[PDB]
């Protein structure tokens, strides 16, 4: 079968050095002149940087001279001015070239930090520059005389050396010399030479540096690049329209900076060509060559020299490297990120009438957005003769179009987005609902997922055009398909504030109210009692209820009983579908219970019942809350009657301690701390006085004498329900507020004795100011810290995707409850939920298989384990997954917005990184958010501990030399370990004990590098997750341990060989590659040997550095260095990753595209 020639759909990419002949291949002409346009008739001057002959017609399908103006004429080259008449588009495509008189060095291979040309020749950089500026002569191919091949001479020395040997020795200077060296260099011969020397001299100093060079050289050899090409003979010119001269208003012109640069290189080049035929003296043509060299450099990458400035403008002219480069990497892919058609935005509002699957869309917005669709539907039914008439119709806004828009709108989701998109719920698909008015209406339940308040925040809309985009939006991005956080399995659609105050006020009970004691047949006549004004919403009542339990085998049982309840809970029962028990609604229904209600409904009846349920809860929540007439008055905030007395007593204490300091009974420092404590203690007293009074002091009577219940006071209901406010914030309203802190951080020993219900005087407010401003500053900065963190995270993960089904490893990590020092800071059930078992678990007794090998532990399974006393469970994790280049679905877990096991192909790295980064706003400024980063950066603490390197008996040897050596001695194994530990650090280690490898030989923090090395992989991963999770959980943030585990797996991706037989001994390399390769030896070729490696721990930012794809690396890394370092090796990017596929603009090799890439990836390496 024939291969191909013309444009097929390409896979992979290649990058390499460009030969002068290769550059000529692209070039359709030589730019011989600095001229641009004619200066009167604005036509391009032949043949200059803008040329119709070299590049293309100024206007579509028309010859420049004007002889051939006809659209028929296409392959025609005008006889007057050779211009083949074709679309002006080719002026954006066709390249050109310039033939340089003298060779010229490429600054990138000269000036990228490891000068490539320098170490290719094993020659210093400063010397090469010394040869380039004609500041000395360098030898080439010295022959047998006096001189080294690479030796450098000065003017007189070259002369002195020349009188003795005229010929059979050669030396040049400048660029031509360097080019001659590169051409003369034989890598093959040099490679052999380098191979012997490694073996001959044995020294680490020697062979360390030695080995680095030989692999590099042979890489360049196998690459196919010829060294000479680092020196430019021919220089390609970029198509004119990519650096346009386009006119402006008022007749002025504007142009890219490259022209000024290109023009210069041309002038100088041309001048030099002239100076050769005039036989100018050396001193000039030399100067002209340096000037040309500088000029080319300024063109390619400006700023590696003097930084030439554009004409008449101080600001330096932008060069080609700066066009690619930026902040950060490429502008193209950097945020932001390309503008997109079919979009819009406006201020957003509520719309509680909406169902959860839809959103209010302004009439005009939908009109302008679906404009092409409207045209097509309008001319599909024949209401418009043609598209033009259709254009006029919607432009006329004839009334008839509105019905047509409801058709084109109906089943057609739109994407809604908020400004800081953090997790994937930052974008969700909705069904359009036509709205008069310019505001976007957004279903209330989603406002939590977006973090969208209504304080004037704006949202952006996107229309999913292609059929595949409509179905992606509906089956993935739809609102109803994500009700559960992917970060933690808990529902994110939990009713927010107004609704839960409604349901809290609804299911609540007072002691004596209308309808107290009566009984009703069912919720129907309960509402009939209430709505008619007979019964109070909260009164204790028995009513007949029918609950349901599906406790049969997939089958619903029914049960009826007399439940003791209130009227509101009875009324509320009408919404609860089928198999939920009345127990869930028989309580007071705070914000905490109302989410777990939704959670259980999902985990039992599935999705569909849960969605419509959520809707109903919101509707009834708002409604009854409106009935409740909740408000806030100034008398709703009750100050304790005992406040002034408490302040005075604490005011007496400071005067006790003060008398003690004047009389010297207590020290000054002791004074500060003493007073601060009593004032602090005072605050707790006032807080817990007003809390008691505020909470229950409503004291009311039913028929009998008195009694007292939880208050119905307005502000309390908000805080108890979970609606808004918290005991801390309330404490500032009624009780005194806090002790503020001066900028210094030293909390002032005279707190704020007033509160907001009273007035704050001048001093108290002024002192309050610092806390606010530092708060805003801290948060506004904590905003910045979070973003960078998610960035580093997604860069190191990203390309990680679920690929295989079951790697089929029994391996996994042991899950126990966290038990931090007290009682159960986190249960076992949350830690293990939704994960898969490593091996079958036994009861406390045995011959009992509870869970059979690998089984997803769902709610029943976790409860069956909890029924029993089960204390410990080993679980497959993404860190242990045997699948290479991805995660096996079994090792990850089920978690998603759906409860089912994770699908094949979901990109989990991103959702893991996003889930970890998003909550980061709430962390503090040890502790806080920077503490998390230290964990993920693997950073070694300042004064770490040291762990026993190897098991066996240890002892001390030699004596204080600034380090006192420690000798460990295994019984059987070799003794030789003696480490020099500074002894001025307090030891722990019993001097006379045998130490298990990895014990604490001193105190202080430990480097996670050790834990991986000494204790093992599972130990360090357990260490990271528990420490980082300590930070979040301390703030009340729920992040499943899974996500942290995947980041960890990426930290240790690389390993360092120990044994040999096929690989590089000391090479750091992917354990993916090694593991697939040692399987290729265990039964393949030679056993050979081998090889044993050692897993390594890389910080997140360092591990993301290594990426196979250079297009990906060129994005977020330093672009110049990436391209150079890649261009020399002739590295071939196969795509395969995410980052790169986004760049080239094809299907992401994940999700919907994962089927595609898979189908294509296999087509490769076949026939």
């Amino acid at each position: 079968l024939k291969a191909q020639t013309k444009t097929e759909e390409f896979d992979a990419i290649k990058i390499a050095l460009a030969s002068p002949d290769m550059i000529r291949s692209w070039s359709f002409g030589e730019v011989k002149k600095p001229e641009t346009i004619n200066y009167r008739t604005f036509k391009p001057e032949r043949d200059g940087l803008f040329c119709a002959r070299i590049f293309g017609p100024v206007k579509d399908y028309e010859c420049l001279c004007g002889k051939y103006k006809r659209l028929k004429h296409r392959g025609v080259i005008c006889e007057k001015c050779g211009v083949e008449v074709t679309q002006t588009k080719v002026r954006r495509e066709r390249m050109g070239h310039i033939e340089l008189a003298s060779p010229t060095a490429h600054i990138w291979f000269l000036k990228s930090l490891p000068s490539r040309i320098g170490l290719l020749l094993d020659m210093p950089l400063r010397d090469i520059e010394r040869v380039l500026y004609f500041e000395s002569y360098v030898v080439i191919e010295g022959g047998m005389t006096n001189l080294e091949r690479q030796q450098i001479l000065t003017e007189e020395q070259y002369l002195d050396a020349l009188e003795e040997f005229g010929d059979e020795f050669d030396a040049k200077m400048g660029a031509e010399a360097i080019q001659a060296l590169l051409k003369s260099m034989d890598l093959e011969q040099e490679c052999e030479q380098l191979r012997e020397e490694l073996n001959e001299t044995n020294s680490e100093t020697k062979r360390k540096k030695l080995t680095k060079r030989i692999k590099l050289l042979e890489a360049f050899v196998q690459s196919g690049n010829k060294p000479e090409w680092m020196i430019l003979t021919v220089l390609p010119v970029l198509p004119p329209d990519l650096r346009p001269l386009v006119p402006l208003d008022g007749g002025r012109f504007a142009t890219s900076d490259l022209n000024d640069l290109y023009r210069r290189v041309i002038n100088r080049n041309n001048r030099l060509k002239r100076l050769l035929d005039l036989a100018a003296p050396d001193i000039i043509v030399r100067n002209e060559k340096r000037m040309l060299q500088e000029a080319v450099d300024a063109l390619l990458d400006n700023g590696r020299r003097g930084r030439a400035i554009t004409g008449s403008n101080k600001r330096p002219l932008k060069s080609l490297a700066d066009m690619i480069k930026g902040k950060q990497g490429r502008f193209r892919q950097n945020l932001l990120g390309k503008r997109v058609d079919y979009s819009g935005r406006s201020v957003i509002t509520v719309g509680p009438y909406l169902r959860l699957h839809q959103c209010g869309l302004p009439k005009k917005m939908a009109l302008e957005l679906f404009k092409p669709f409207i045209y097509g539907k309008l001319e599909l039914r024949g209401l418009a003769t043609t598209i033009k008439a259709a254009k006029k119709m919607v432009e006329r806004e004839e009334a008839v179009v509105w019905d047509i828009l409801d058709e084109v709108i109906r089943e057609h989701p739109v994407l809604l987005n908020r400004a800081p998109t953090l997790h994937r719920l930052g974008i969700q698909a909705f069904e359009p609902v036509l709205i008069e008015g310019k505001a976007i209406q957004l279903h209330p339940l989603v406002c939590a997922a977006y973090n969208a308040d209504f304080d004037g925040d704006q949202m952006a809309v996107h229309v999913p055009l292609t059929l595949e985009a409509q179905l992606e939006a509906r089956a993935l991005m739809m609102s109803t398909n994500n009700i559960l956080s992917p970060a933690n399995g808990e529902p994110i659609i939990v009713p927010s504030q107004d609704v839960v105050l409604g349901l809290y006020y609804m299911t609540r009970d007072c002691v004596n109210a209308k309808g107290e004691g009566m009984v009703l047949t069912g919720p129907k006549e309960a509402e009939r009692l209430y709505r008619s004004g007979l019964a109070s919403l909260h009164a204790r009542v028995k009513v007949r209820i029918t609950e349901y339990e599906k406790d049969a085998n997939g089958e619903l049982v029914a049960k009826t009983s007399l439940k003791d309840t209130t009227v509101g809970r009875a009324i509320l029962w009408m919404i609860v579908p089928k198999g939920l028990p009345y127990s869930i609604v028989n309580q007071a229904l705070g914000k905490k219970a109302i989410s777990k209600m939704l959670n259980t409904c999902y985990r039992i009846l599935g999705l569909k019942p849960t969605v419509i349920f959520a809707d109903q809860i919101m509707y009834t929540g708002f409604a009854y809350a409106a009935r409740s007439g909740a408000s806030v008055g100034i008398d709703d905030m009750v100050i304790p009657e005992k406040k002034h007395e408490i302040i005075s007593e604490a005011e007496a204490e400071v005067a006790e301690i003060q008398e003690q300091f004047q009389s010297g009974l207590v020290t000054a420092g002791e004074r500060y701390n003493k007073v601060i404590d009593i004032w602090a203690a005072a605050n707790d007293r006032v807080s817990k006085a007003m809390m008691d009074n505020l909470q229950t002091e409503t004291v009311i009577n039913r028929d009998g004498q008195e009694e007292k219940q939880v208050s119905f006071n307005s502000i309390y209901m908000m805080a108890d329900s979970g609606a808004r406010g918290s005991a801390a914030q309330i404490r500032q309203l009624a009780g005194m507020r806090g002790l503020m802190a001066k900028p210094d951080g030293s909390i002032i020993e005279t707190p704020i004795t007033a509160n907001f219900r009273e007035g704050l005087n001048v001093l108290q407010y002024f002192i309050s100011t610092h806390g606010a401003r530092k708060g805003l500053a801290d948060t506004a900065l904590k905003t910045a810290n979070s973003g960078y963190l998610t960035r580093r995270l997604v860069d190191v993960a990203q390309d990680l995707v679920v690929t295989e089904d079951d790697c089929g490893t029994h391996e996994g990590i042991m899950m126990t409850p966290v038990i931090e020092g007290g009682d159960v800071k986190e249960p076992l059930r949350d830690r293990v939920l939704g994960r898969v078992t490593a091996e079958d678990v036994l009861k406390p007794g045995t011959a009992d298989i509870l869970v059979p090998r690998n089984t997803l532990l769902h709610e029943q399974w976790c409860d069956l384990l909890e029924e029993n006393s089960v204390d410990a469970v080993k679980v497959r994790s993404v860190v242990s997954c045997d699948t290479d280049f991805g995660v096996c679905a079994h090792c990850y877990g089920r978690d998603l917005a759906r409860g089912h096991i994770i699908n094949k192909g979901e990109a989990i790295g991103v959702i893991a990184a996003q889930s970890i980064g998003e909550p980061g706003t709430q962390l503090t400024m040890t502790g806080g958010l920077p503490r998390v980063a230290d964990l993920f950066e693997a950073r070694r603490p300042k004064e770490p501990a040291i762990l026993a390197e190897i098991s066996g008996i240890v002892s001390f040897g030699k004596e204080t030399k600034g380090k006192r050596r420690l000798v460990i001695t295994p019984v059987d194994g070799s003794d030789p370990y003696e480490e020099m530990i500074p002894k001025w650090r307090q030891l722990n280690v019993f001097e006379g004990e045998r130490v298990e490898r990895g014990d604490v030989i001193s105190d202080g923090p430990e480097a996670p590098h050790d834990i991986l090395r000494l204790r093992g992989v599972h130990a360090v991963t357990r260490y990271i997750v528990n420490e980082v999770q300590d930070v979040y959980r301390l703030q009340g943030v729920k992040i499943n341990d899974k996500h942290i585990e995947v980041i960890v797996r990426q930290m240790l991706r690389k390993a360092t060989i120990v044994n040999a037989g096929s690989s590089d001994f000391l090479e750091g390399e992917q354990v993916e590659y090694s593991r697939v390769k040692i399987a290729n030896r265990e039964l393949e070729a030679n056993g050979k040997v081998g090889a044993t490696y050692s897993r390594d721990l890389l910080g997140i930012t360092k591990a993301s550095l290594a990426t196979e794809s250079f297009i990906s690396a060129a994005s977020f890394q330093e672009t110049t260095r990436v391209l150079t370092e890649a261009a020399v090796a002739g590295k071939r990017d196969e795509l395969r990753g995410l980052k790169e596929n986004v760049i080239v603009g094809r299907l992401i090799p994940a999700g919907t595209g994962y089927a595609y890439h898979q189908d294509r990836m296999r087509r490769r390496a076949a026939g």
Partner: protein, 89 residues
């Protein structure tokens, strides 16, 4: 409208292979090649295909099967026309 695609995801597990298959089907209907297998409520092809997945009358196998039949159904017509290309000889 189709509020939740859950029923289709049960029918096809992946939930991604669902988007693809329903897509392939929606084009068989949208570009005017076939007609629906289930009452159309005025729902656009997006949802009509999804109802077809939920009701179990459409999946990757049938389409590949169905398409594979049409390959031979059209190949039967052109039978005389392309065998007339004996002009190779």
């Amino acid at each position: 409208a189709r509020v939740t695609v859950q029923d289709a995801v049960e029918k096809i597990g992946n939930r991604f292979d669902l988007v693809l298959v329903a897509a392939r089907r929606a084009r068989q209907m949208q570009v005017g090649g076939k007609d629906p297998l289930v009452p159309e409520e005025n729902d656009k092809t997006t949802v009509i295909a999804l109802r077809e997945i939920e009701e179990g009358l459409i999946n990757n196998q049938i389409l590949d099967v169905r398409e594979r039949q049409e390959q031979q159904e059209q190949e039967a017509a052109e039978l005389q026309a392309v065998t007339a290309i004996a002009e190779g000889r």
